[PDB]
Amino acid sequence: HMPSFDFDIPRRSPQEIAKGMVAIPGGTFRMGGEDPDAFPEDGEGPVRTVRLSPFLIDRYAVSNRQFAAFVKATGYVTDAERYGWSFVFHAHVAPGTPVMDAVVPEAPWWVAVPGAYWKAPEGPGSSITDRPNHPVVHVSWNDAVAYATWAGKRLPTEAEWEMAARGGLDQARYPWGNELTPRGRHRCNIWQGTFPVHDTGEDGYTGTAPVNAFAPNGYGLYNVAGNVWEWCADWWSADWHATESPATRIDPRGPETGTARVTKGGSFLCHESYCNRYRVAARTCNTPDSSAAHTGFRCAADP
Template sequence: MPGLPISCSTNTPGAGANCGVNGSDDCCSTLPVPGGTFNRLNLPSLPATVSDFYLDKYMVTVGRFRQYIERTGGPTQANPPPVGAGAHPKIPNSGWDPSWNSKLTADTNGLKTALVCEQWDWPSWSNAPGAEEKKPIVCATWYELFAFCAWDGGRLPTQAEINYVSAGGNQQRIYPWGGASVEDIELDDASWCCQGDGTVAGDCKTGYPSLYPCSPSDLTDVGKFPKGAGRWGHMDLAGNAYKATRDGSEIYQLLVPCNDCSRLDNNSISRFMHGGSFLAAGYKQTTDFQASYRSDDRRYYVTAMCARDL
C-alpha cells in the first residue's frame, strides 16, 4: 500500500469523510495509477514512461493543511521537513533539500499570516476553521506544498506523472474526461473561466471574453464536478486550481528521454504546474497546456495533489 495519508485521521471538515459531490467521500482517498508509456503534452517527440503509483483523488484541502499546522506547527524554519523527505523512490536526490529551509516562514504565526495572502485578497485559508475547509489550499508556496505532501506520507508528483493521469495514459486525452477538440469543455466539467459559482462569464473556450466577473466563489470545494473525472477516477485534474509538480521549469523544456524522470533543478526559481484553474480559459485546462510559477510565490490559483508509492 502507499504511504497512507494521516491528515484525515481526525475526521474534521475537509479532512475526513465529507468531500466530493455528495459530501460523504474520504477527502484523503488515494487511487492507484497503473504505469505505462505516453506522450507528454500529446507530442510524439516527448515520450515518457512512469511506474505504478498512487495519486490522491482530491487536491489538498484547507482542512487537511490545517491538520498539518495544528499537529506540527506546519512547515517553518523552526520546523522544516526532514532532509530527503518526500522523495520519489526511483529518482535519487528528489527529496527535501535543506537549502530550502530558508524559503519557509520563520514560525507558525508567520505562516498563518502569509497564507491569508493579503497581496491578492483571495485566500482559501482562514486562521480559524470556516466555510472553506473543503476548498483547495491556495496561496501556499511550492515549498509548503512539497512539505505538506511529505508530512502526509506522500510527495509531489512529477510533471510526467500528473500529465500521464490527466491524459488517461496512452489514451492521450485532450481533457481528463476525453473530448475530440479544445472545444469539448462545458460548465459541468470543471471550474474554469470564472464560472465555478454557476455564473456564466461567456464563451472563453479558446480565449478570454473582454469582461468576465471572477470572484473567490469560483474556487469550489474539491470534487464537485464528477463529469470531469479522469480515467482512473481522480477529480479536478482540470480546473479549480493548478496542480504543482516536482519539476523545475527554469530551463523551460521537458527531459528526453524520460523514464520516471523529473527535472530536479533544486535551486530553480520556478516550477511546472498543470491542469488549469478556475480563472483560466478552456484551452488552458487541456492536458497539453504547460505553465509554471515561481517557487516562492503565493498564488490564489495553485494547489497540489499528493502522489504516493507502492
C-alpha cells in the same frame, strides 16, 4: 531538493497513506502536446512516449480541512504568513481591504494583499469556514512539500501528474476527451465570460469549487483541469524534455536545476481567450516561495 522542517515525520501505515489515492500502474503514455496555438515559451512539445514506474496519486487536491490538520499537528507557518501577503484576484478583494501598490507586470488583475493566506484567502476579514472541502490555496511549493512529507507522500513529477490527469486517454485535449463541454455539461471550473472583467459563473463557481466537484476522469481523479493550479516536483524548463534520452523518457524528473517549479492543470481563472492553459498538456511555473489564491496541490506516493 533538500528541504528543512521543524517537525518530525510521523509514522503511518501503507493503508493510511493510500486512503483517497489511486494506484496508477507502471506503463507508458504519450506526454506533451502539439496544439498549433500553444505558446512556444511553454514548451508543451514535443509529444513523446514516457515510461513510468507504478505510483499512487491523490484523487483530490489537498483540502483546507486536511491542511488545517497538518498545521494543527506541526505548527507549520506558510511562506505567505512569513512574507505577510499573498496574491488575490482583483474581483475577490473586498473594498476597503488594505492592498499593496505592487504590480505583477502584464497581469494587473493580481493584487498583493497583506494578510491573505490559506486561512484568510481574500485577506483580513475572510475565512475558510464555508470552504473546508475546497482546495487549500496560498500554499507555496515549499508548503506543499512540507505537507506531503508530513503525510508520508511527495509531489508528483510533471509526467506522473500528466499520466494520471489524462486518465487513460491517448493524446486527448482534456482529461475526459476532446470537447470542453460535452453534451453541454461543464466538466471543470474555469472562467466563462470576458477575462479579466466579468466571470459569468456558468460552471457554478467564480472562485474555487470543492475538491470533489464535477465528474472524475477515467482513473478517478477530480479537478485535474481547472479549479487550482497544482504544484509538481520538477524544476521548470521549456526544453529539457526535448532531448531524447533515458533521463527524459523513463521516470523523468526534469532538469536538475532551475528557478521556478512546474504547475499543472489550470485554474478557475483560465480562459481560451487569454491563456488557454486548462488543456491537459498545458504547463507553466512559479517560483517556489510564491503563493496565490488559485494555486494548490495534490500528492503522489511511491507504492
